[PDB]
Amino acid sequence: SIARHQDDIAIEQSHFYVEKALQNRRENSEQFSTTYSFWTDAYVYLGNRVDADWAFTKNNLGSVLYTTNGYDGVFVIDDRGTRYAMLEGELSERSLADSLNADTGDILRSARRAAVDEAAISRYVDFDGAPAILVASAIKPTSDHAPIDLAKASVMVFVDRLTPAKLAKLGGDYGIANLHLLADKESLALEGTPHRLAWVS
Amino acid sequence: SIARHQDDIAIEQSHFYVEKALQNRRENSEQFSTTYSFWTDAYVYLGNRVDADWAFTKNNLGSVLYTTNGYDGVFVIDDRGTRYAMLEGELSERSLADSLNADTGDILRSARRAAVDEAAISRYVDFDGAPAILVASAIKPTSDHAPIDLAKASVMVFVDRLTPAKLAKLGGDYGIANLHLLADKESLALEGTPHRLAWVS
């Protein structure tokens, strides 16, 4: 019953589909993270001492996560810090905390709590000065295994850096013109980061 | 320079986002399928004789694929037919061919060809009278393993049945009103099936 300016309708549509693009991307990475972490073999070879031979050399948690799945950062963390790091498909000694603005302990504790509900967590992070989607889930074995203490579980972390190419393809997948990191246009904040995504509308 | 009826613009937008919803869903399931099939452990325990204890009892390819990932059908096939079937998270003796309209040999051959390019295949199928997204990828070990003959590789198949609830959630994820299986409205065909998806516009 309220007539609206056409520019206002297109601006609302663009905001709706930018938010949906981010939301669908997060939920999908959450299930992907749970697929890799709710895994008995992952629990054996990554939940205690990190077997980088099994993870990287044998490609059970290796470079394909970057060259195929596009996760610029794959990490295993526990109470002592980063136990395994793969940046751009290569093994690294760099910790998760050094590459993030968010608190690593908060990520560890939150992922352990979500695992109770068979869930992962996600959030936006500042990843080396760039916006990124972070998902994390506890490393635990499946129900056929004897129960473990989720309070001491290691946590698997997948970092999705929103590069200009990724934003260009993601916006195209949702019909949004010139989705980019804001350096007139529409914009929204990635909460928990200083970054804002912008687009034409 | 050409002015257009507002109903025509909304109809074109709705078609764009129904097609994008299906496309993004297919591409995502293709990477998920490749994650499960390009796997040395999967090659050992599913690429030859099917170890249902490893797959289902030990939950390495088990009911979570349905109760979490929503794949109503998970199959392993080879030149002799269906070697492993899980319908709605339960082991089954029903073959993939009996539950499909598409040719099982075509799926096997096509997935073996796509594996050369490290890719999966996808298509729409008639799955027990319902529309469905099928993805398939060859079961092969990772590059650290000695090379195998892709012509004799088993193929992993994930079937995503587009139930009314799934279409309701998928359409909502893309701002489409009343996405459903067509029994005035907009419509498109799922090629390779007798099914058409319909929505309000």
Side-chain angles (χ1 to χ4, degrees):
Chain A
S1 185
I2 299 291
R4 298 186 49 75
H5 198 299
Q6 283 299 129
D7 296 358
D8 287 5
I9 294 181
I11 286 168
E12 295 184 14
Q13 284 182 317
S14 68
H15 276 268
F16 174 87
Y17 285 109
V18 174
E19 296 165 13
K20 281 301 188 175
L22 298 171
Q23 177 179 343
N24 303 337
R25 194 175 175 106
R26 290 174 59 178
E27 302 303 307
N28 175 59
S29 289
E30 287 181 20
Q31 289 190 14
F32 194 79
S33 179
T34 267
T35 291
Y36 260 98
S37 74
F38 297 175
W39 180 15
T40 299
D41 294 328
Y43 176 79
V44 171
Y45 295 91
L46 300 174
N48 307 112
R49 184 257 301 178
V50 168
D51 190 336
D53 172 79
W54 177 91
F56 197 82
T57 303
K58 301 195 184 309
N59 287 281
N60 295 307
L61 190 86
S63 66
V64 174
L65 293 175
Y66 177 61
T67 60
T68 291
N69 308 112
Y71 291 114
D72 306 86
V74 175
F75 304 84
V76 173
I77 67 176
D78 64 7
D79 291 308
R80 283 149 295 277
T82 295
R83 305 301 298 266
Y84 178 87
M86 197 197 337
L87 289 172
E88 291 175 47
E90 298 183 13
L91 290 180
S92 177
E93 302 304 279
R94 193 184 181 194
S95 74
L96 180 63
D98 177 72
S99 58
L100 290 189
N101 65 320
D103 188 285
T104 289
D106 289 355
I107 299 174
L108 178 69
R109 182 172 61 256
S110 301
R112 288 170 171 169
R113 177 53 187 80
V116 177
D117 304 319
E118 308 301 316
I121 64 171
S122 63
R123 62 162 296 163
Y124 303 112
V125 294
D126 185 11
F127 187 66
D128 277 2
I133 298 177
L134 181 147
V135 304
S137 51
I139 306 172
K140 67 178 187 167
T142 41
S143 65
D144 49 291
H145 192 277
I148 75 166
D149 181 12
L150 285 178
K152 52 86 186 173
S154 301
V155 163
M156 192 176 292
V157 180
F158 300 88
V159 184
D160 176 9
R161 190 175 195 255
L162 298 181
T163 67
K166 284 193 188 166
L167 294 175
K169 198 264 184 177
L170 173 65
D173 288 359
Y174 286 79
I176 294 139
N178 190 27
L179 183 57
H180 67 276
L181 173 64
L182 182 63
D184 209 7
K185 299 171 181 180
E186 293 309 305
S187 178
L188 59 78
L190 299 188
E191 300 296 338
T193 80
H195 300 298
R196 300 187 60 89
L197 297 189
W199 59 94
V200 168
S201 286
Chain B
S1 185
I2 299 291
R4 298 186 49 75
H5 198 299
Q6 283 299 129
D7 296 358
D8 287 5
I9 294 181
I11 286 168
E12 295 184 14
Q13 284 182 317
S14 68
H15 276 268
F16 174 87
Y17 285 109
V18 174
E19 296 165 13
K20 281 301 188 175
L22 298 171
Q23 177 179 343
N24 303 337
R25 194 175 175 106
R26 290 174 59 178
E27 302 303 307
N28 175 59
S29 289
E30 287 181 20
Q31 289 190 14
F32 194 79
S33 179
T34 267
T35 291
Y36 260 98
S37 74
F38 297 175
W39 180 15
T40 299
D41 294 328
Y43 176 79
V44 171
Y45 295 91
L46 300 174
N48 307 112
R49 184 257 301 178
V50 168
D51 190 336
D53 172 79
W54 177 91
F56 197 82
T57 303
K58 301 195 184 309
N59 287 281
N60 295 307
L61 190 86
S63 66
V64 174
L65 293 175
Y66 177 61
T67 60
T68 291
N69 308 112
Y71 291 114
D72 306 86
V74 175
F75 304 84
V76 173
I77 67 176
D78 64 7
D79 291 308
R80 283 149 295 277
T82 295
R83 305 301 298 266
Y84 178 87
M86 197 197 337
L87 289 172
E88 291 175 47
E90 298 183 13
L91 290 180
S92 177
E93 302 304 279
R94 193 184 181 194
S95 74
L96 180 63
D98 177 72
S99 58
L100 290 189
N101 65 320
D103 188 285
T104 289
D106 289 355
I107 299 174
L108 178 69
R109 182 172 61 256
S110 301
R112 288 170 171 169
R113 177 53 187 80
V116 177
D117 304 319
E118 308 301 316
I121 64 171
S122 63
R123 62 162 296 163
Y124 303 112
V125 294
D126 185 11
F127 187 66
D128 277 2
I133 298 177
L134 181 147
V135 304
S137 51
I139 306 172
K140 67 178 187 167
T142 41
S143 65
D144 49 291
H145 192 277
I148 75 166
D149 181 12
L150 285 178
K152 52 86 186 173
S154 301
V155 163
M156 192 176 292
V157 180
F158 300 88
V159 184
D160 176 9
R161 190 175 195 255
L162 298 181
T163 67
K166 284 193 188 166
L167 294 175
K169 198 264 184 177
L170 173 65
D173 288 359
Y174 286 79
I176 294 139
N178 190 27
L179 183 57
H180 67 276
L181 173 64
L182 182 63
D184 209 7
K185 299 171 181 180
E186 293 309 305
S187 178
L188 59 78
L190 299 188
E191 300 296 338
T193 80
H195 300 298
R196 300 187 60 89
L197 297 189
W199 59 94
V200 168
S201 286

